[model samples]
Target: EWIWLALGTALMGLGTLYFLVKGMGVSDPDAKKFYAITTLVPAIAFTMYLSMLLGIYWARYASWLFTTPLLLLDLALLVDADQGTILALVGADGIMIGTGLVGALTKVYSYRFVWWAISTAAMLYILYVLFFGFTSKAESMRPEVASTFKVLRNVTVVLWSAYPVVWLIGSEGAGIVPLNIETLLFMVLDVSAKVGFGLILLRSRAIFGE
Candidate 1:
């Protein structure tokens, strides 16, 4: 069952990729219709596949099998630097949103609460970056600034990269308390310190411009 599910998911992913490329190649008039149809087809197929797995009582393993292929596809698309990357990101975003919605509907967690938590954390991160991270330029001249920045960059990458793993683990079984804690904290801190500050520096012409 697991092997079959894996094979099916792989084929679906390839098919989706092919359709996306082919659709993009069509002239503007025909391409619009092709893209619209192709966009929803893979998602519908995935939904049916999931429904079948659940009905067969192998939902847990099936979810793993399905998600593994998705993860690989996402990674590949992320590196492609083309339409494939855009489609992959869109598909992955759909999966994440679908997971949240399904979890909410099944009473696994409250959708409102999850959104509130993520939003609050993100807002706080933005505030921190605006107030502290972006305004710490003078501190950049310190002897340890380079090392500190490097370490901060590494931490940021690590945290962002681990986010999906944290989300997956937290959604499974009785719920992963540790992963939740880590994800929430890491995302807020890392985003504030890394992306927010990085953007600020860019806009302020403190790092690359001027």
Candidate 2:
């Protein structure tokens, strides 16, 4: 419905870039994590987008499940003391987005309310991880390498942060934004988040020292 499947097909190609690069070796933990995350991002986005357009019910939580990991993968890419913290935030994000997805599919306004609330919280936590967690951790690495990571973090933050903005206007969020714009924005942001950041991380393997 409404080019959702067509969009999904495009997403499949985007996911492929990940497959070729990150699908190198099983022991490649970073690539393995990324491959899982990348495949899930498009699959869920496409599935959720299809579900919404075509009236599928079971996929209500689908969007949340993938989106949370997409965000969390940023943290996972880095090695830090806050492993538990990252997991907690990632899990919370999954639930929050799940709430958003349910509200969207079921048209339950209350779910969206919780979704927005959690989005705000989860977004702040993401920022904190970047500003405090990311910055603090960067202090340990060499300046040149840290600079690379800083840029990586900045790119990641900008792309990740862009998501909630468009979501606010979509049906799942404040709903002020028109439908025509909603789908396009979602596609752009998702592509940027998955392909844009995924490639950067791939290129940054040396900097990542993994």
Candidate 3:
């Protein structure tokens, strides 16, 4: 089943590449080669994300995020395991951050405040998890390793739960979630920073304008 799914994803990626070439109008002789090469990262990331989700689901353990370490253990036990999935997710996230950065650099959009807010929140969240989440000495010293994992598991839940709330104001305009008070506040902040300050920067020809 996994093989079949992988094959299907590969086919879809190939089809997307074909269309991109046709749409982009490859005037350069090497265009086809470049297009095919560049698409490899996204294809791998998609496959990895899919495979990891499946493995986590099949393992039948609650909380996929909490089971991340266990998934790594499974990969070690299974020869054909998709260890690359984790890499793919990390790569994909990097791509997203790159996109946001580019948007700010090129003045395609004002993403500075959004980026700063999200990044700061993410950093603080990680710090919280490291200290409050993993600092239970008694829990860490448990005879059963699984028990220690369970303690970490609760941490994962708490972290994920608060993740969306950190910069909820800025992310709201992206329509990333349903409209509500929390989301509205986020959207307002996003608009104020991106649109309000963005216009000022545009008129002043400041750092972002360059």
Candidate 4:
């Protein structure tokens, strides 16, 4: 049924509005930029979901290509990552998503695995930077900020890993999971990643510089 997609659309819509309203209450300029990103991610997702409902098969990937880099940017800004690091992270993220899309769209079974492997390689680079490259920097920050970054980073790792697993089992890969279930899982993952993460971030007094 389209009900699941409908539900996803509604949740993203609410998330967009919720973040937008909450951002207005933020005072710190940097925090404002962060909160604005929080708002923007879901708003973009809201548009994607609506497009998906309207029969755009590639809408979800479109959302990810744009949103995932911004997601990484949020974390990079937190640790004040250098320009080179930021560029590498963003470029790798784009490759991961883009290659994954190619893999999903591929008609040849073996070729799909090739693209998936390429995408996974890009993700490995990202995970390395997230887990190690920024570790000391984040730890050297205020205690609350360090703790918050850890939780958010861990959440990102777990949730992001689940995406490939879902992709494997979902219709795109093995066809082990039905389309509805796949859609439901993606919806939950996206909401948690963007909106839920944002809520935790913005509500943290330390991160918000309050």
Candidate 5:
């Protein structure tokens, strides 16, 4: 079911690609790259990354306002497995911050090195956490739920952190992931970030405190 939702939203983001410029925010003719499509679709969909629709100059400053809260919800919702959750939270929030930094640098396209470094650093952190951060939390969750999150995180970690590699190869970063693949890659990430990520979140615990 979660897989269905993730795949569904991924397709939806892509299907809506053509309509993206119809006030869906990718108005500039040449701006339809991976990250651009990634955020605009999200912006259209009302997710936290919606700030991606914001201009790079503004996103550079305010993107974290969007990214941080979503990431920093460290313990707002979840079945806690003690400090393993805490450890996972640290890496998660930090990577969110790193991505926010990546968001900041997106429009400064010439800073290829900056994007490369930050993204690679973020990718590595997610890799560490995925393998070593939350084993205890898994023990605390229901077996089926634990399985779901682990699968989700596995895809999420590799692809989520892998964006810098995309940027470096495409026109966005160092021009090395192939510009041809940018939009598809961007569309792919948005699905994971928005739907799968959030769906698992709500089921974990209530976000609003009573």
Candidate 6:
């Protein structure tokens, strides 16, 4: 546990620093906003890991609650999605994370499933928004931008889907997976979903015109 928390903290800290510096170089307001928001996602995770190291275990929920909205916003901004779309997605995302936290903390096994069902349903709505609702604008953008958006979109969807599965199989739900392994898996996913996604977003020359 100590090792995983330490590793996560260091990784998230490095990601935060990297994005912070990179954001400084982007001149375009939109690109700058992207970088700035990406920088915060990892910084929040970094704080969560730091707290975990100090014995706070529930910080990941808060981290996700905060960071997930920004992550969705980053995607929405790519397509210049309307305010309604952004608000709807963000609102749904909050329900997902919030209910998941409730489910995780719930004492009774069967009762927990209620919150999980609500959370998963919210996630499905979010995925629908990403796949059908937002892709049209991105498709009409430059070919390079379109392709980059597709790659990023696919990666985000794939990675985000794994979280629910992990929760279901891990100690939180079924108790089939050991706690240590679950923690390790979550650390890997968090880093990949946030840091990896941000790297791809920032490094996409087609998207940033860099």
Leading candidate by lDDT: 6
Poorly placed runs, candidate 3 (over 4 Å):
1-82, 99-143, 170-210
Model with the higher TM-score, candidate 3 or 4: 4
The lDDT per prediction is 0.40, 0.61, 0.36, 0.85, 0.46, 0.88
3-108: candidate 5 lDDT, tens digit per residue: 3334444454543443344324434332233224333434444432233333122332253344433432332123233555545655655665566466545666
Q: For candidate 2, lDDT tens digit of each residue in 8-69?
A: 54664656555565566656654466566655555555556555666532353456466656
Give the TM-score of each candidate.
0.27, 0.71, 0.23, 0.94, 0.50, 0.94
Better of 3 and 5 by TM-score: 5
Using lDDT as the yardstick, the better of models 3 and 6 is 6
Candidate 6 residue lDDT tens string, 25-106: 5698657778888899999999999988877457887898899999999898788789998999999999999899888888
Off by over 4 Å in 2: 1-8, 21-61, 102-115, 142-145, 207-210
**Residue 209, candidate 5: how far off, in angstroms?**
14
Q: RMSD per prediction, one decimal?
A: 16.7, 4.1, 21.2, 1.4, 12.0, 1.6
Put down candidate 3 lDDT per residue, 95-189, tens digits, no spaces.
43343344434432356546645544444444343344334432444344234334333443444335345434333335455434433342233
lDDT of 6 at 30: 59
Candidate 5: Cα lDDT at 105:
57
Across 141-177, the per-residue lDDT of candidate 1 in tens digits comes to 4334333343443444444445444544554323665
Q: Write the per-residue lDDT of candidate 4 for residues 131-185, one digit (tens) a residue.
A: 9988788998888778878888898888888888998888888899998788889
- Pairs that collide, model 1: none
Clashing pairs in 3: 168-186, 169-185, 169-186, 169-187, 170-186
Clashes of 1: 0
